[PDB]
Amino acid sequence: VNIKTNPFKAVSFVESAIKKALDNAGYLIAEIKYDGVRGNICVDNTANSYWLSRVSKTIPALEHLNGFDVRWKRLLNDDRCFYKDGFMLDGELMVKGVDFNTGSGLLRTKWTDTKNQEFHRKKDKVPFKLHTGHLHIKLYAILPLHIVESGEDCDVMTLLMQEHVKNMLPLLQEYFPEIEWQAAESYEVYDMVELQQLYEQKRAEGHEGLIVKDPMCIYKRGKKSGWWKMKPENEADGIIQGLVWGTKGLANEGKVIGFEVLLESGRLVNATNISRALMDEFTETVKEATLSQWGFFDACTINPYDGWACQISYMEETPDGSLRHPSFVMFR
Numbered sequence: 436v437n438i439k440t441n442p443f444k445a446v447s448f449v450e451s452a453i454k455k456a457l458d459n460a461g462y463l464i465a466e467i468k469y470d471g472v473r474g475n476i477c478v479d480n481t482a483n484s485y486w487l488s489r490v491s492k493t494i495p496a497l498e499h500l501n502g503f504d505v506r507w508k509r510l511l512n513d514d515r516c517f518y519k520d521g522f523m524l525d526g527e528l529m530v531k532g533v534d535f536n537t538g539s540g541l542l543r544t545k546w547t548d549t550k551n552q553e554f555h556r557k558k559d560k561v562p563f564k565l566h567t568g569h570l571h572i573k574l575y576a577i578l579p580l581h582i583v584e585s586g587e588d589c590d591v592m593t594l595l596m597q598e599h600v601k602n603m604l605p606l607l608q609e610y611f612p613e614i615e616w617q618a619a620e621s622y623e624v625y626d627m628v629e630l631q632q633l634y635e636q637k638r639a640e641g642h643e644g645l646i647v648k649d650p651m652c653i654y655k656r657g658k659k660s661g662w663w664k665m666k667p668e669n670e671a672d673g674i675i676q677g678l679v680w681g682t683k684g685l686a687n688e689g690k691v692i693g694f695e696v697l698l699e700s701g702r703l704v705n706a707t708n709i710s711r712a713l714m715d716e717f718t719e720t721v722k723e724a725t726l727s728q729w730g731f732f733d734a735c736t737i738n739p740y741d742g743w744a745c746q747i748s749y750m751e752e753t754p755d756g757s758l759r760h761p762s763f764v765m766f767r
């Protein structure tokens with residue numbers, strides 16, 4: 436319909452599905468699931484761009500990057516550009532300096548609060564323009580525009596799309612050096628233990644997930660199977676009543692990675708996969724409370740959280756009630 440960009444939206448973690456992609460492909464693409472605003476930058480053969488969203492609506496802080504710019508004409512003419520018909524870039528639009536969800540608020544703002552262009556005071560009525568020098572973007576796909584307009588799936592499997600994006604990247608950086616153009620970080624994992632290892636390595640850096648991509652899946656339209664969110668999206672309850680610590684026999688952590696959480700049903704779940712920042716914050720609390728013994732692991736560790744009711748998140752649920760890949764969300 437009238438530029439219904441309608442991008443590929445990953446479906447939620449389904450381990451059986453991912454296991455079948457793995458078997459059939461020989462590995463899995465896994466990228467960080469960035470938290471920003473998804474941009475679908477349409478550039479036509481008229482040398483016009485549209486900084487659209489996942490919902491085919493223009494993005495306020497970036498509405499000022501739309502319309503005609505000669506450098507798109509020159510980029511399309513370039514040998515190295517394969518989309519002479521025009522193209523759509525798919526990726527995450529991040530702001531530099533701020534945290535996620537300040538960046539995102541910044542992008543949806545129209546009326547100031549200054550991270551502005553003008554320049555490189557304000558009291559009201561001012562169309563805010565996000566300064567390009569604040570925009571960091573992370574591309575994961577690019578489509579020939581006529582396929583975006585038709586609604587059809589773009590028949591480029593995942594492993595090829597990355598070639599198409601690493602090839603577009605220097606034309607973009609050359610002609611438009613205002614913006615920080617980059618490719619999403621992708622890792623190729625050969626087994627399910629490698630997938631879990633990577634996932635929690637990234638939870639530990641405060642990224643709350645990955646998008647697992649079937650390397651042989653093509654670029655599909657709308658929410659469809661093939662791209663999977665590996666992120667705890669089922670939230671849940673319980674009381675904390677224990678501390679799970681950190682594997683001193685073979686691993687990264689020497690102090691508290693989560694809680695023993697008694698679930699409503701009678702299940703004891705060890706809700707861990709947390710940020711590193713929450714790990715080191717929880718250990719100080721454990722370390723201090725126990726230092727009214729002075730020792731710190733007639734005497735045992737005070738957990739200054741036993742009995743604390745909480746909300747745990749998990750990825751999915753096995754027949755026998757097992758919660759697959761559970762993490763802590765917040766006490767409640």
Ligand SMILES: Nc1ncnc2c1ncn2[C@@H]1O[C@H](COP(=O)(O)OP(=O)(O)OP(=O)(O)O)[C@@H](O)[C@H]1O
Pocket residue numbers: 443444445466467468469470472473489527575619646662664
């Ligand atoms: N590296 C990535 N590869 C693909 N999609 C990604 C990637 N990183 C972030 N995303 C995003 O995650 C999406 C799909 O996840 P999801 O359906 O949960 O939406 P959400 O934006 O994360 O949250 P919500 O829909 O509830 O508002 C995309 O629309 C996109 O913006």
